[PDB]
C-alpha cells in the first residue's frame, strides 16, 4: 500500500562532441511516466504511461520548460565540478540527481529526498529532516556553504512535503488501474543436472508488481545466502517484473532445499518444495 514519486536526472559531458547529454525520467513506484532526452528531436517532456496523457497543454509546456532549466543548471554544474576537483577539460564526467517523496498506505507524506552524485559517488544530499545537508567530501562542503547561504533547503522542503505529495496523489488516482494494483508472483522451481552428481535448483518469480520481492533458499531450514545466486529484479516489458535465485546442490539432497517467496501480492509467503 505504500507509494513513491521519484525523478531521476543524468547529465554527461562529452567535451569536444557538443553539449552534455541530459536525460530525465519520472516514476510513480516502479512505473515510469515521463521522459526528456536532450538528444531527441522533440525537445519536449513526453508521456511514457497512458494515465499521464490526459494532462493538458499547460502541464506539458510547463514541464518541458522546467526540465530544460534543470538541464541548463547541470550544464553549469559540470563546469563548476571540474573546477572544484581540478579536473581536465577533456574527460567525460557524470552528474546525477534524484529527488521525490514517499507516502504510506494512507497517502500521507512519509519521507522526502533530494540527492546528488558526481562520477557515481555521493556528492551532497538533504538529510531526513529536510533542513540540513550531508556533504560527502571537501568540494561538496563548498556547495553546502552556498546552498545554506541561499536557503536552498527551505525551498526544497516546501516542494517535497507539499507539491510532490499533492501530485503523487493525483497520479495515483488518475492511474489507479495501473498504479494501485498488485500482481502476485507466479512461482515455480526448475531442476537441471550439471553433472551426474550435482543439480541446479532455480526458484522463479514471474509477472509480479510492484518490483520489491524477496526470494531465499533454505537447506533444512537454514538460509543458504552465501551459496545462492540471486539476479537483479528485471522488467518483463509489460509492466511486470521477474526474478530468480539459484543454488547448485548434490544430487539426492533436493528434498532438503526449499525456496521462500515474499511479495505484497501474496496473502501469505510461499514455501516451494521438492516433495
Amino acid at each position: 500500500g505504500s507509494h513513491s514519486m521519484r525523478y531521476f536526472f543524468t547529465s554527461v559531458s562529452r567535451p569536444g562532441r557538443g553539449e552534455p547529454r541530459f536525460i530525465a525520467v519520472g516514476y510513480v513506484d516502479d512505473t515510469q511516466f515521463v521522459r526528456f532526452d536532450s538528444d531527441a528531436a522533440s525537445q519536449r517532456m513526453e508521456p511514457r504511461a497512458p494515465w499521464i496523457e490526459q494532462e493538458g497543454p499547460e502541464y506539458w509546456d510547463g514541464e518541458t520548460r522546467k526540465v530544460k532549466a534543470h538541464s541548463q543548471t547541470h550544464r553549469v554544474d559540470l563546469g563548476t565540478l571540474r573546477g572544484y576537483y581540478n579536473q581536465s577539460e577533456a574527460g567525460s564526467h557524470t552528474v546525477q540527481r534524484m529527488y521525490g517523496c514517499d507516502v504510506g498506505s494512507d497517502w500521507r507524506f512519509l519521507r522526502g529526498y533530494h540527492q546528488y552524485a558526481y562520477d557515481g559517488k555521493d556528492y551532497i544530499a538533504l538529510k531526513e529532516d529536510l533542513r540540513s545537508w550531508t556533504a560527502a567530501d571537501m568540494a561538496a562542503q563548498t556547495t553546502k556553504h552556498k546552498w545554506e547561504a541561499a536557503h536552498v533547503a527551505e525551498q526544497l522542503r516546501a516542494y517535497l512535503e507539499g507539491t510532490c505529495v499533492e501530485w503523487l496523489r493525483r497520479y495515483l488516482e488518475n492511474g489507479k488501474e495501473t498504479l494501485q494494483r498488485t500482481d502476485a508472483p507466479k512461482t515455480h522451481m526448475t531442476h537441471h543436472a550439471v553433472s551426474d552428481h550435482e543439480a541446479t535448483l532455480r526458484c522463479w518469480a514471474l509477472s509480479f508488481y510492484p518490483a520489491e520481492i524477496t526470494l531465499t533458499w533454505q537447506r533444512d531450514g537454514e538460509d543458504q545466502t552465501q551459496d545462492t545466486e540471486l539476479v537483479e529484479t528485471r522488467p518483463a516489458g509489460d509492466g511486470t517484473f521477474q526474478k530468480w535465485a539459484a543454488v547448485v546442490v548434490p544430487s539426492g539432497q533436493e528434498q532438503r532445499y526449499t525456496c521462500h517467496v515474499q511479495h505484497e501480492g501474496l496473502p501469505k509467503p510461499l514455501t516451494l518444495r521438492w516433495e
Binding site: 525523478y7 514541464e63 543548471t73 556547495t143 501530485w167
Partner: peptide, 9 residues
C-alpha cells in the same frame, strides 16, 4: 510534477 529550477552546485 517536477520541482522548480535547481540551484547550481
Amino acid at each position: 510534477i517536477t520541482d522548480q529550477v535547481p540551484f547550481s552546485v
